[PDB]
Design a protein around this ligand. Structure first.
Ligand SMILES: NC(=O)c1ccc[n+]([C@@H]2O[C@H](COP(=O)([O-])OP(=O)([O-])OC[C@H]3O[C@@H](n4cnc5c(N)[nH+]cnc54)[C@H](O)[C@@H]3O)[C@@H](O)[C@H]2O)c1
Ligand SMILES: NC(=O)c1ccc[n+]([C@@H]2O[C@H](COP(=O)([O-])OP(=O)([O-])OC[C@H]3O[C@@H](n4cnc5c(N)[nH+]cnc54)[C@H](O)[C@@H]3O)[C@@H](O)[C@H]2O)c1
Ligand SMILES: NC(=O)c1ccc[n+]([C@@H]2O[C@H](COP(=O)([O-])OP(=O)([O-])OC[C@H]3O[C@@H](n4cnc5c(N)[nH+]cnc54)[C@H](O)[C@@H]3O)[C@@H](O)[C@H]2O)c1
Ligand SMILES: NC(=O)c1ccc[n+]([C@@H]2O[C@H](COP(=O)([O-])OP(=O)([O-])OC[C@H]3O[C@@H](n4cnc5c(N)[nH+]cnc54)[C@H](O)[C@@H]3O)[C@@H](O)[C@H]2O)c1
Ligand SMILES: COc1cc(C[C@H]2COC(=O)[C@@H]2Cc2ccc(O)c(OC)c2)ccc1O
Ligand SMILES: COc1cc(C[C@H]2COC(=O)[C@@H]2Cc2ccc(O)c(OC)c2)ccc1O
Ligand SMILES: COc1cc(C[C@H]2COC(=O)[C@@H]2Cc2ccc(O)c(OC)c2)ccc1O
Ligand SMILES: COc1cc(C[C@H]2COC(=O)[C@@H]2Cc2ccc(O)c(OC)c2)ccc1O
Lengths: 267, 267, 267, 267
């Protein structure tokens, strides 16, 4: 109820699936939260859902705009007098096909922009008000695409989630000297939010297939489980971990099962 | 106070520095704990320190003896009716010099025995009473020597802490199908327990030097911080993570600073 | 003399230190080479140095311009009738200070542009003329900053050399199905080319300090040694390796020596 | 024909599939080779196949016996006056079932013995005659099981191929200071030698299934391709690489394809 008693957090991408569950869970633990996002009304329905303006508020922030990240942070210092936690949770997918041949050049630029520079800007301004307090935890959401590939996950998303781990490792080596921890969380498929762009995509259905394909049975990965991993990294109880890419895939990425399924027996 | 309400845990190596702080912290969180060890009287002073026989008890167990691991587990099922958590925390150092030339062949065998087979045996018997309950978390203590080297850490200790990550990754791929999570924790120097074998070794003093050499300043790594990492992995809040080697080094292993210190400027 | 007999290669960044030694070594092995670069006259003195126009030629190509990468590749197909090898060896450093606080936003964009999109564009057009031949090796130069950090290596260079490994792993998973291998080479400090921007930087002198700080003694890392690693990956003898980040650091990144040097003995 | 002109090599496990192709290829490159093995007559038919006693000879050596590794090395110094290359290529599989529950305790001990201590002993005696020459390359065969898991690859084989990478990384950090490089090679399924223990196992047939399951199409992984990777590491052209686990899996381990195949489209 108060494990994060004290704390002031900013959730970048906080109107979304992992961002709202995380904010909900940081409020349940005693913190003051600022959800930041470009999705206006969804960001407002999320906040005014969870608690009152005294604990959560919404700020518009387009994290590829430095004037907006400057404003998001300076508005959190003016509201709550400090910054303990920054969770940089913005990420977008590609909107061109997977093959390198049909993968767009503009699309590459823009996914690189939202996903990596957007994370650089967030760490830049959080490090501005955390270095003088000589305390802080910056948590980035990377992905299991921060170290593996997948047929169907575009080459710019893999390249961008590797560069997010790249800033995690790099910021960690600069900032641990000011007592600031930098970590990232690498989830597998997080369950929803009821999906159609193509057809197939429906989101009782993507977790059903994520279970087919899962190492680890009997549990569904939901946003609540990533939330618990960044609540650990964010506060409470993780004050000597800064190395970390905290993979939350139930062990999916520890094996490639293609030659074992080609193994089998009984015919 | 009750985050681990329910739980039945076995701490292998539980009379030692990381093992006692962990057991202390699992009792503070509502669990029933069995400390297992070859250090008789220290294991008894640790238990009878923490709480009453109703929550913690001591069992003698030499984890390179399968009859003793069989007995440690069957005695936990007979006392508490189940097994939720197994923390395999036994590890020993080498007692021959570092150079491959002076590194002992008997010593190699025996460190391999305590550190790897001892961990295989613990997972073997815990998996015996966890697979029918189709629930469980096995946590191993590995080390940052599970993926790096160090001048002065013997070649059998590096090779054994890599093989502990090897069983972590391997058991994870077998057991996630019975809903059992397998993880390991990789700490940097954990502070004590007031050390002399050589001279130099004194243990207000090893953390002082671990801070010299540390990425991350202003905090000392103590057994309480590894304890918090295995309490996360053990229960509460980590039920879709099974991939993990949870490094707790404040970012030490993310850089080699030798060519940056050879960089400098001011002469 | 003819180990690469047949071969047609493009060296992106080929007027530079690793690019010219590599081209020199692919010509010594029987290949036809196209050096591509924005450094006009240096690219021309490199080519007209090595051999005649029948084996090496220079093309101007600014690898952040797709019309120029389109032209570099189509000019190699028109000259030599095919494309066997693409070595994407362009990389730039940061020109703002290391601290996240003083690290430039424009500089981030531009280093991201040259180093990652520039590599995406090279793989995009090489994959255009390699997929119909269903043969090919794409080699990228990443860095040991593709998986570690360093005080003094800017946060955009770490983030960009992680994203180059990201495209290596991702392109490998797409293109191995057309028989195309994708690899990268991760060198430590490569010796020169006689350096001043600041003072200190002089390049008999940087390898002297790279030896101070080196795992592995008695050898200096020079461009000839990276050249040998990409000649292996490029042809000859590596036709079932596609996973690879081929680290060429003499073991530098396998240890952090800060707590061992804080260890020592004799006082 | 003479790329390895000079060289004196020991192939541990050299009567086997990867060991004989490697020895064949080191003789074709100008070296003097000593195949070492417990398979007597097969080791003799391999040697007396390849060339005369002046270049290859067979020594019996059970690499879990230090008196035999002492003898194998001292017999190579007495025959050829030096030691340039040590390739520790012994490995055995498990002979108990995969499940941790049915995995044998004696079998664990013995696979640990052949695979890890056997590699420790080889590096121990090679480092004896290489440190005074202050030159040398020790190459170990690890496996892709040195960093991943597989259903059906026993928990002691994963744990042993991780500990072989553990000694590779550890020996590298000790021995690079005497100018000695330590590397390992991690192959996927190497094609044969015409297999029955169970039925299914036949070895035109295992490469057929290794291709089903392969990243990288159109090539079969054969012992000749691992041979080329250890010839690179062993001599010629790799004299600043010592970090390395040289994966030769055509990219198999860079992806887990289970959720992409659960993705698909057309129904
Ligand atoms: N959901 C998964 O299965 C999955 C897996 C692994 C990693 N991730 C990452 O997890 C993070 C959160 O994703 P999610 O919650 O699943 O998706 P989501 O529901 O799309 O939430 C992400 C939020 O980012 C917001 N956003 C986009 N651009 C900007 C911008 N430029 N400025 C400010 N806000 C912006 C967007 O409005 C959205 O609410 C992202 O980094 C993902 O890439 C997702
Ligand atoms: N302390 C550090 O700085 C450090 C760093 C990284 C990893 N580790 C690992 O952390 C684990 C715990 O170590 P610690 O608490 O620092 O040391 P410790 O105080 O030596 O505790 C380990 C316990 O293992 C016990 N033990 C030894 N052999 C057996 C056996 N065969 N059967 C049963 N019990 C046995 C021993 O009595 C001791 O109490 C070990 O695996 C270490 O290798 C330690
Ligand atoms: N040299 C080292 O110590 C070191 C270490 C690790 C990795 N690397 C990487 O190795 C690669 C080669 O670097 P190097 O040979 O040392 O440096 P270099 O001498 O600067 O050569 C790189 C070449 O890239 C060229 N270039 C820059 N921008 C463009 C552009 N947009 N279009 C076309 N050409 C361009 C540039 O003219 C130069 O000749 C780069 O990716 C480095 O980042 C270098
Ligand atoms: N073949 C594959 O698909 C595969 C994949 C990945 C790694 N590996 C490893 O590659 C290495 C070579 O295996 P391979 O050539 O396929 O198999 P192999 O044909 O069994 O050859 C290995 C040799 O080791 C020999 N040997 C066994 N015990 C001893 C001993 N105690 N002392 C001396 N010699 C002994 C044995 O006689 C055999 O000839 C081993 O380390 C494997 O574990 C194999
Ligand atoms: C099992 O691995 C992953 C796969 C998925 C499924 C997709 C959503 O996010 C991804 O990266 C996946 C596939 C995808 C589809 C379309 C794209 O536009 C895209 O590229 C950016 C990616 C999710 C998390 C995992 O981590
Ligand atoms: C910074 O890295 C580490 C170094 C240390 C210091 C030593 C204790 O445990 C080790 O492995 C270290 C060195 C050492 C000394 C003597 C030995 O007998 C031994 O070999 C087994 C190891 C601790 C944790 C770290 O993870
Ligand atoms: C030991 O590690 C490395 C360090 C170096 C030395 C520098 C040149 O390239 C780098 O990345 C290093 C430091 C540096 C200085 C100034 C910068 O502008 C820069 O940022 C982009 C980097 C080279 C290769 C290594 O791999
Ligand atoms: C795709 O991955 C691998 C799988 C294989 C197939 C088997 C032979 O070696 C292995 O480790 C695999 C499976 C296996 C079967 C029986 C066992 O006794 C054993 O355990 C030791 C292992 C080979 C190389 C790969 O690297």
């Amino acid at each position: 109820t108060n494990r994060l008693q004290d704390k002031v957090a900013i959730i970048t991408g906080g109107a979304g699936g992992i961002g709202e569950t995380t904010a909900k869970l940081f409020v349940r633990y005693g913190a003051k939260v600022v959800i930041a996002d470009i999705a206006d009304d969804h960001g407002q329905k999320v906040c005014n859902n969870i608690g009152s303006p005294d604990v959560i508020s919404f700020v518009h922030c387009d994290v590829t705009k430095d004037e907006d990240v400057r404003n998001l942070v300076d508005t959190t210092i003016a509201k709550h007098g400090k910054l303990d936690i920054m969770f940089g949770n913005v990420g977008v997918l590609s909107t061109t096909p997977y093959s390198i041949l049909e993968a767009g050049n503009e699309d590459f630029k823009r996914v690189m922009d939202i996903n990596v520079y957007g994370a650089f800007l967030v760490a830049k301004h959080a490090a501005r008000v955390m270095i003088p307090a000589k305390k802080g935890s910056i948590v980035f959401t990377a992905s299991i695409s921060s170290f593996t590939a997948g047929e169907g996950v575009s080459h710019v998303y893999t390249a961008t989630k590797h560069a997010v781990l790249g800033l995690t490792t790099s910021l960690c080596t600069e900032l641990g000297e000011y007592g600031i921890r930098v970590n990232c969380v690498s989830p597998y498929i997080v369950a929803s939010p009821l999906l159609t762009d193509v057809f197939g995509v429906d989101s009782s259905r993507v977790e059903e297939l994520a279970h087919q394909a899962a190492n680890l049975k009997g549990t569904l990965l939901r946003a609540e489980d990533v939330a618990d991993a960044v609540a650990y990294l964010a506060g409470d109880e993780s004050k000597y971990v800064s190395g970390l890419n905290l993979v939350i895939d139930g062990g999916y990425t520890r094996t490639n099962p293609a030659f074992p399924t080609a193994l089998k027996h009984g015919l």
